[PDB]
Amino acid sequence: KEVLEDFAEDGEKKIKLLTGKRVQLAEDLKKVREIQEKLDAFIEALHQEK
Amino acid sequence: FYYYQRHFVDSELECNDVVLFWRIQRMLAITANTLRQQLTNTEVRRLEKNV
Amino acid sequence: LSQVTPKHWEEILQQSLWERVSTHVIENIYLPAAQTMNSGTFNTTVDIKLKQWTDKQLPNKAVEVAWETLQEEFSRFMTEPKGKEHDDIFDKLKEAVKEESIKRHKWNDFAEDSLRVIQHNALEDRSISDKQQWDAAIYFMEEALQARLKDTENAIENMVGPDWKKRWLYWKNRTQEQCVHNETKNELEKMLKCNEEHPAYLASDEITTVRKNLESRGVEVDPSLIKDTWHQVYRRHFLKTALNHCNLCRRGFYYYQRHFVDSELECNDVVLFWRIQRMLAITANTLRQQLTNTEVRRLEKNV
Amino acid sequence: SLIDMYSEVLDVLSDYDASYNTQDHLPRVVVVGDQSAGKTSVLEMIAQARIFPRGSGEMMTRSPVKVTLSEGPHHVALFKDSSREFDLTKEEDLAALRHEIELRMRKNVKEGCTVSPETISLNVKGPGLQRMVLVDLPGVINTVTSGMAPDTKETIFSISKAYMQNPNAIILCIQDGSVDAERSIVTDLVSQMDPHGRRTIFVLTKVDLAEKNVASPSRIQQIIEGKLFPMKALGYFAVVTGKGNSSESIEAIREYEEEFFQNSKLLKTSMLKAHQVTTRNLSLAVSDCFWKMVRESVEQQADSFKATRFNLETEWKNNYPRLRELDRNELFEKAKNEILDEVIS
Numbered sequence: 001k002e003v004l005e006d007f008a009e010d011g012e013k014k015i016k017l018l019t020g021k022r023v024q025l026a027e028d029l030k031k032v033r034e035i036q037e038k039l040d041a042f043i044e045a046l047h048q049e050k
Numbered sequence: 051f052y053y054y055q056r057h058f059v060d061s062e063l064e065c066n067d068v069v070l071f072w073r074i075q076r077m078l079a080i081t082a083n084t085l086r087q088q089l090t091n092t093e094v095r096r097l098e099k100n101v
Numbered sequence: 102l103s104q105v106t107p108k109h110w111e112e113i114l115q116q117s118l119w120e121r122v123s124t125h126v127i128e129n130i131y132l133p134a135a136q137t138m139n140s141g142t143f144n145t146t147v148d149i150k151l152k153q154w155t156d157k158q159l160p161n162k163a164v165e166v167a168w169e170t171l172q173e174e175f176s177r178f179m180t181e182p183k184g185k186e187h188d189d190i191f192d193k194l195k196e197a198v199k200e201e202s203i204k205r206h207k208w209n210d211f212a213e214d215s216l217r218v219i220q221h222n223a224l225e226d227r228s229i230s231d232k233q234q235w236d237a238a239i240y241f242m243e244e245a246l247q248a249r250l251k252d253t254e255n256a257i258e259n260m261v262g263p264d265w266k267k268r269w270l271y272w273k274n275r276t277q278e279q280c281v282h283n284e285t286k287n288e289l290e291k292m293l294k295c296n297e298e299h300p301a302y303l304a305s306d307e308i309t310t311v312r313k314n315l316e317s318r319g320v321e322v323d324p325s326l327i328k329d330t331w332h333q334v335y336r337r338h339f340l341k342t343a344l345n346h347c348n349l350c351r352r353g354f355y356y357y358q359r360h361f362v363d364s365e366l367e368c369n370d371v372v373l374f375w376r377i378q379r380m381l382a383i384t385a386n387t388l389r390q391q392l393t394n395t396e397v398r399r400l401e402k403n404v
Numbered sequence: 405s406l407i408d409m410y411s412e413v414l415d416v417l418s419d420y421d422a423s424y425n426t427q428d429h430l431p432r433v434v435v436v437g438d439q440s441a442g443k444t445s446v447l448e449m450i451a452q453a454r455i456f457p458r459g460s461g462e463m464m465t466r467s468p469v470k471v472t473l474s475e476g477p478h479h480v481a482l483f484k485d486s487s488r489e490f491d492l493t494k495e496e497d498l499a500a501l502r503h504e505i506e507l508r509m510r511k512n513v514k515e516g517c518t519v520s521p522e523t524i525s526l527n528v529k530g531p532g533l534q535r536m537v538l539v540d541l542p543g544v545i546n547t548v549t550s551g552m553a554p555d556t557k558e559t560i561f562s563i564s565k566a567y568m569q570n571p572n573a574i575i576l577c578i579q580d581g582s583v584d585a586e587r588s589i590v591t592d593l594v595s596q597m598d599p600h601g602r603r604t605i606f607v608l609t610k611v612d613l614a615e616k617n618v619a620s621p622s623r624i625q626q627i628i629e630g631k632l633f634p635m636k637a638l639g640y641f642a643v644v645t646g647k648g649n650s651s652e653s654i655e656a657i658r659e660y661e662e663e664f665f666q667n668s669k670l671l672k673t674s675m676l677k678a679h680q681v682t683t684r685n686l687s688l689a690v691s692d693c694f695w696k697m698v699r700e701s702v703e704q705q706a707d708s709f710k711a712t713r714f715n716l717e718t719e720w721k722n723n724y725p726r727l728r729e730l731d732r733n734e735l736f737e738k739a740k741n742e743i744l745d746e747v748i749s
Contacts, residue, residue, distance in 0.1 A: 004740050011732070018732055026729040029716050031420045035413065036709045042409035043702055049406070087225060141723035148718045152711070 102178055103397060107389055110170075115385040118166045122159075123245060126377070130154070131370075135339070136301050140367050147373060155221060160213035167388045168208060171396070175199075198404070205403045209395055216387065223383045224376050235354045238375035239347055245374075246347075250340045257333055261286060281320055285327060288314055289334045301335055303328055343370065405475040407535035408527065410698065414537065415484070415525055424569055429705060431697040433536060433690075434567040436590055437578035439463060439543045442609030445645035446578055447471060447540055449654060449683055451528050453492040455481055456540070457506045458650035463549070467509035468523040468563060469540040476529025483508075484525040492530070518553035521563055534691045539567060544590050568597055572697055574690070575604045581614035581642070584623075585632065594635075601637040605690065608642045612664055621675055628676055638693075641686040642676075658683070 007013055053061050134146040179195045229235050262268060262279045275283065288311050293299060308324045315322050350368040357368065417427055437443025440461060448454045451473060457464035479492045481501060490501040505526075512520040519542055542560045549556070567573060577594045585591050591606070598604045608614075608627065626632035628640045644661035646652045665671055665681050679685050720729060730738065 008736065014732055014736060018735060022724060022727070022729075023732065023735065025716060025720055026731060029713065029720070029729060030731055031416075032709060032713045032716065035416055035420065036706070036713060038409060038413050038416065039702060039706045039709060042406060042413060043706060045409065046406045046699065046702075083226070084222070087222065091225075141719065144722040145715070145719040148722070149715050152714070 102175060103393060105174075107393070110389045110392065111385045113170055114167065114388050115381050117170055118163065118384060118388075119381055121166050122162060125154075127245070127249065131373075135370075138298070140369055144369060151224065155224075156217060159220065160216050163216060163384060163388065164208050164213060167392060168206070171392055172203065175400075202400070202403050207399070209391075212391060212395070216384075219387060220380050220384060224380050226376065226379070227372065229354075229357070229372065229375055232354055234375060234379075235357075235371065238371050238378055239351060241378050242347060242371065242374045243344075246340055246343055250337070250344075253333065253337045253340060257286075257337060260330070260333070281322060282326075282330060284315065284318060284320055285311070285322060285330045286334065289331055293334065293338055299335075303331055346370070405535060407472065407537060408474045410702075411470075411472040411474070411525065411527065411537050424566070426705075428570045428572075430570070430572060430701050431694055432567065432570050432573040433538050433576055433694065434541075434564065434573050435539055435576045435578060436541055436564050436594070437543050438580065438583075438588060438590055439545050441543065441578055441580045442645035442648075443541075443543060443578040445657075446607055446609060446643060447538060449643065449645065449658065450534070450538065450687060452530065452533065452654055453479060453481070453528070454498060454654060455492065455501055455505065455526075455528065457502045460650070463543050463545065463552075464506065465509070465540060465542045466506075466518065467512050467520050468542070469505065470523050470525040471538040471540055472525065472527045473533045473536055473538065474527060474529050475533060475535065476531065479530035479533075481526060481528040484527065492528070516553070517555065517559070518551075519556045519559050521559060534687050536691050536694055541567075546589070565597075572701060573603070574694060576690075577604070577606045578609060579607075581608045581610045581619070582617055585627070591633075595633060598635065598637075601635045604635060604637040605686075606633075606637065606640050607686070608640075609645045610648065611642045612644045612646075612661070613648070615668070615670075621670065624670075625675055628680055639689070640680065641689075642681055643683050643686065 053063055054065065130147060130150040134143045134150070137143050137146070176199060179199050180192065229238075260279070261282045262275045263271060263273060268275065292307075292311070305324075308327055311327055312322060312324070346368070349366060350371050353366045353368050353371075356364050356366055414427070414430065414432075417430075421427060435443065435447065437446075444456050444458070444465065448456065451471060455471075456469070481490045481492055482488075483504075490504075491497045492501075505524075508524055509520075512522045512524070514520055523539070541564060542556075544560055544564075545552075545557060548554060553559075568575065575594055575598060577590060579585075579588050579591060594604060594606075606627070614624070623632065624642075628642065630636055630640060644657070644664060646657035646660065662682065670676055671678060671681065
C-alpha cells in the first residue's frame with residue numbers, strides 16, 4: 001500500500017512504465033474525443049446565436 | 051413453384067398468400083439483422099455514457 | 102424493355118459493377134493492406150480505405166454502371182434487326198431520338214446519398230452465418246485471383262518466354278534479354294525460397310548481392326531491371342500464397358464457427374471478400390428496382 | 405462566449421499537437437511591431453484596458469502573450485493557469501496585473517536567454533468586447549540591446565514566422581507614422597511573406613503626430629489606398645495611439661482621436677475614405693472576416709476529427725474487441741487490484 005501511494009503521487013514514473021499500443025490508443029482517443037466535444041459545443045452555440 | 055417459375059398467371063394456382071408471407075419473412079430477417087447491428091454498435095456507447 | 106425477367110438485370114448489373122471496380126479494390130486497398138503481417142492493423146487499414154472510397158467515389162461509379170447497362174439494353178432494342186422484316190426508314194428517326202434522349206437524361210440526385218448509407222450498413226456486418234456463403238466467397242475469390250494471376254503470368258511470359266521444355270516443342274529461341282530475365286528470375290526464386298516472409302520493398306544491398314551473382318554468371322544487369330522483375334515475381338508469389346491460404350481456409354469454417362481467434366487460420370481475406378460479394382448482391386438488386394421504377398417515368402417524360 | 409470555446413480549442417490543439425500540422429488549419433491574428441511603434445497602445449486600445457507593462461522606451465514585453473477578448477458580465481482579465489480574477493475597471497488592479505504579467509514573463513525565461521518563446525494565454529473578458537483572439541509579440545529592434553540576449557532578435561523573428569506559417573492567419577502589421585516605409589524592415593518582411601495580400605492588414609500609429617509633422621498627403625493616401633506598397637492587401641486602416649505618453653487613459657485617447665479625425669481637414673476634403681479610419685471600423689471588419697473564416701474552417705475540422713476518431717475506434721475493435729479503453733490513472737487502479745489478488749492467491 002505504501003509503495004502504491006508513492007507511485008500514485010509520481011505520474012512521471014507511470015508514464016515511463018506505461019508504454020504500449022493499448023495505452024497510446026486510449027490516450028489519443030480521449031484527447032481526440034475531448035477536442036471533438038469542444039468543437040461540437042462551439043459550432044452549435046455559434047449557429048444558435050443567429 | 052414450378053408453375054410460378056414460368057409465370058403461369060393464367061393458371062388458377064395463384065399463390066398470392068405464399069408470396070406475401072415470403073415477403074414478410076424476408077423483411078423480418080433483414081429487420082432482425084439490422085437491429086442486431088444497431089444494438090451491437092449504436093446503443094453500446096450510449097449505455098456506457100449513461101452508466 | 103420493362104418486360105424482362107429481374108434475374109437477367111441482376112446478373113448483368115452485378116458482373117458489370119464488379120469488373121468496373123475490381124481493379125481499384127484489389128490494387129489500391131487489398132495489396133497495400135496485405136503487406137502487413139498484423140491482422141488487426143490489416144483490418145484497420147481496409148476499413149479506413151473502404152470509408153474514404155465509398156463516401157465519395159462508390160455512388161458515382163454505381164450510377165454510371167447502372168446507366169450504362171440501361172443504355173446498352175435500350176440502344177440495342179432500338180437497333181435490333183428483326184430478320185429480313187426489319188424496316189430501315191424508321192432507323193434514322195430512332196437514332197436521332199435516341200441521341201437527344203440520352204443527352205436529356207438525368208439520374209436522381211438523391212439516389213447517390215441514399216445508397217451511400219445503404220451499402221455502408223451492408224458492408225459493416227462481419228458475421229457469416231451460412232456455410233454455403235463461405236464456400237461461395239472462396240469460389241469468388243478463386244475466380245478473381247485466377248484472372249489476376251493470368252495477367253501476371255502473361256507479363257512474366259512476355260519478359261521471359263516459354264519454358265525450355267515448351268520452347269523446344271515450339272522451336273522458339275529466347276533472346277539475349279529474355280535469357281537475362283530468366284537468370285534474374287532464378288536468383289529471385291532462391292531469395293524468396295530462403296526467406297518465405299520477405300517484405301515487398303527492396304534494399305540497395307540486396308541489389309548488390311543479386312548483381313554480383315549475375316556477374317558470377319557473366320551477366321550485367323541494371324538495378325532498375327532487377328526491381329521491375331522483383332515486383333512481378335513478388336506479385337506472382339503472393340497470389341500463389343493466397344491460393345494456398347484458400348485451400349487451408351476451405352475447411353476453416355468449422356473453426357470460425359467456434360470463434361477460434363487463437364487459431365492461426367484467421368481467414369480475414371475470405372470474410373472481406375464475402376462482405377464485398379454480399380454488398381454487390383444488395384447493390385445489384387437495389388439498382389434493378391430503381392431502374393425498373395424510378396427512371397422509367399423520367400425516360401417516358403423525356404421521350 | 406463563442407470565442408472562449410475557440411480559444412480553448414486552440415489551446416488544447418497546441419497541447420495535443422506540438423507541431424503545427426493541425427494548428428495551421430484555423431485562422432489566427434498575428435501582430436508584429438517595432439520598438440516604440442505603439443504596438444502595445446493599439447492592442448490596449450482594442451482590449452479597452454491597459455494591461456501590459458509600460459516602460460520609458462524599454463521593451464517590457466519580454467514574452468509573448470495570447471490576449472483573448474470575449475464577452476463577460478464585467479471587464480476583467482483572467483489567467484489560464486491562475487484563477488485569480490483581476491478587475492480592469494480599477495486602476496489599482498490594473499497596476500497589479502501589469503506587475504503579475506511582467507513577473508510571469510521573467511519566470512518563463514530559460515537560462516542563457518532574455519526572451520522566452522513560450523506563449524501565455526490571457527482571457528480578457530468584458531461586455532461588448534469583440535469576439536476574437538489576439539497575439540502579442542515582442543517589438544522588433546533594429547539594434548540589439550546590450551541588456552538582452554544576442555539571439556533575442558532572432559527569437560522574435562522566428563516566433564513571428566512560426567505564427568505567420570498558418571495560411572489562414574491574419575497579418576496585423578504595426579509601425580510608426582513618423583517613420584518612412586523604407587526605414588523599417590517589418591513592412592518589407594510582411595510584403596515578402598504575403599505576395600497575394602489576401603489576408604494582410606496594415607495598422608499605422610501616431611497618425612496625429614505624423615499630421616503634426618506636416619506629412620505629405622500623397623504618401624498617406626498611397627499607403628491607405630495601397631499604391632506605394634507593391635502588395636495588394638484587402639485594406640488599410642489608420643489609428644491614433646494618443647500623444648505617446650505611457651500614463652494616458654484609454655478613454656481620453658479614444659475621445660481625442662475621434663475629435664481629431666472629425667475636425668481633420670483631410671477627411672472633410674475626401675482625400676481619405678471616412679470608413680477607413682477609427683478603431684471601431686477596423687475592429688468590426690476584422691471580427692466579421694475572422695469569424696467567417698473560422699466558421700468554414702471549424703466545419704472541415706469537425707468532420708476530419710470525427711473521421712479520425714472513427715478510424716481509431718475501428719483499430720481498437722480490430723485489435724482489442726473484448727477489452728475496454730482506460731486512461732493512465734485507471735490502468736494504475738486496475739493493476740494494483742490485480743496485485744492484491746495475487747497476494748491473496
